[PDB]
């Protein structure tokens, strides 16, 4: 949830959250980890803003 | 609630060690954990979801008291002495 | 069982009369030894062995002569809450008397001939055919 590497490699370049239906993988923990991702400032708000 | 203060109240009532689910030890653990939970329903006063979970064990508190009543009239009175019930 | 040990046994046996398994097994009270020590002797099934002493439990051997299976139509009648204590000169003969009629007499459970030989009826346990 807190890692800049292991979360931003598994976000999409449109800024949004990767679905597991395309990634294929812990996801139910990873989703809520990226649900709270917006305040950490190791990421942008999204890729377009 | 569940671990800490229950561990100091368990051996207060057991006829020996690890007789935990005996009916004396049962209700006195349980009735204690209706007073303290009623501190939580001393306020919040809109949690109608969880209030039945309180209403669950209040009726079972009277259920096992029947099991003291029908078997041993002595031990029945002894714990409601120690708890001040009804 | 929860709320009749002998009714819920009689579902367990004739389900073996619908897939033709060899051995059947149910948790066995001391009444339940006295059940299948009648069904064996009248010939409806073959052999049984009680086992277990903290779970006393049976090993009944079924009996299907063909694709046809021998125990055709067994029915419990006196179900709890509908006791039918038969006086003996009413007695249910099962299928014009061609079967047997398991009656809980005083002198035991083994009952074809309580009509004349023993001479006292009681609660029906189950018809057997």
């Amino acid at each position: 949830y807190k890692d800049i590497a292991t979360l931003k490699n598994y976000i999409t370049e449109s800024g949004k959250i990767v679905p597991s239906r395309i990634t294929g993988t812990y996801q139910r923990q990873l989703a809520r980890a990226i649900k709270r991702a917006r305040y950490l400032s190791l990421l942008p708000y999204t890729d377009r803003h | 609630l569940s671990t800490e203060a229950t561990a100091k109240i368990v051996s207060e009532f057991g006829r020996d060690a690890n007789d935990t689910g005996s009916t004396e030890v049962q209700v006195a653990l349980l009735t204690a954990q209706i007073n303290h939970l009623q501190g939580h329903f001393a306020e919040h006063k809109k949690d109608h979801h969880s209030r039945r979970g309180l209403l669950r064990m209040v009726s079972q508190r009277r259920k096992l008291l029947d099991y003291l009543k029908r078997k041993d009239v002595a031990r029945y009175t002894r714990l409601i002495e120690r708890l001040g019930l009804r | 069982s929860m709320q009749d040990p002998i009714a819920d046994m009689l579902t367990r046996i004739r389900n073996g009369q619908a897939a033709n398994k060899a051995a059947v097994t149910m948790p066995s009270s001391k009444l339940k030894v006295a059940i299948a020590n009648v069904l064996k002797e009248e010939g409806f099934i073959e052999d049984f062995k009680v086992e277990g002493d903290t779970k006393p439990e049976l090993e009944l051997t079924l009996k299907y002569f063909q694709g046809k299976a021998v125990v055709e139509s067994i029915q419990r009648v006196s179900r709890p809450g509908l006791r039918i204590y038969k006086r003996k000169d009413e007695l249910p003969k099962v299928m014009a008397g061609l079967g047997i009629a398991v009656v809980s007499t005083s002198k035991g459970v083994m009952t074809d001939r309580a009509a004349r030989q023993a001479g006292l009826g009681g609660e029906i346990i189950c018809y057997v055919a």
């Binding site: 305040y39 400032s41 942008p44 708000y45 803003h49 | - | -």
Partner: protein, 77 residues
């Protein structure tokens, strides 16, 4: 008691008042994108031990402060 964790965000032009604020809020330890800013700072985090009430005095001192904007508390068991 219960273990906890402290998460907050630090003002860049008053990043020089980090350890002075630390020893102020270490009293409870001993007691028991445009966000209108540069998006460049340094973080200070630690895993704390304090129970349910010793913590409650800490957060209610941040509506009177101007450097930190968001107060976030989590756990790891």
């Amino acid at each position: 008691m219960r273990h906890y964790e402290i998460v907050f965000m630090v003002h860049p032009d008053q990043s020089e008042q980090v350890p002075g604020m630390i020893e102020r809020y270490t009293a409870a330890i001993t007691g028991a994108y445009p966000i209108n800013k540069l998006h460049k700072a340094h973080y200070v985090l630690m895993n704390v031990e304090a129970p349910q009430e010793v913590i409650d005095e800490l957060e209610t001192t941040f509506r009177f402060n101007d450097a930190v904007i968001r107060s976030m508390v989590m756990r790891t068991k």
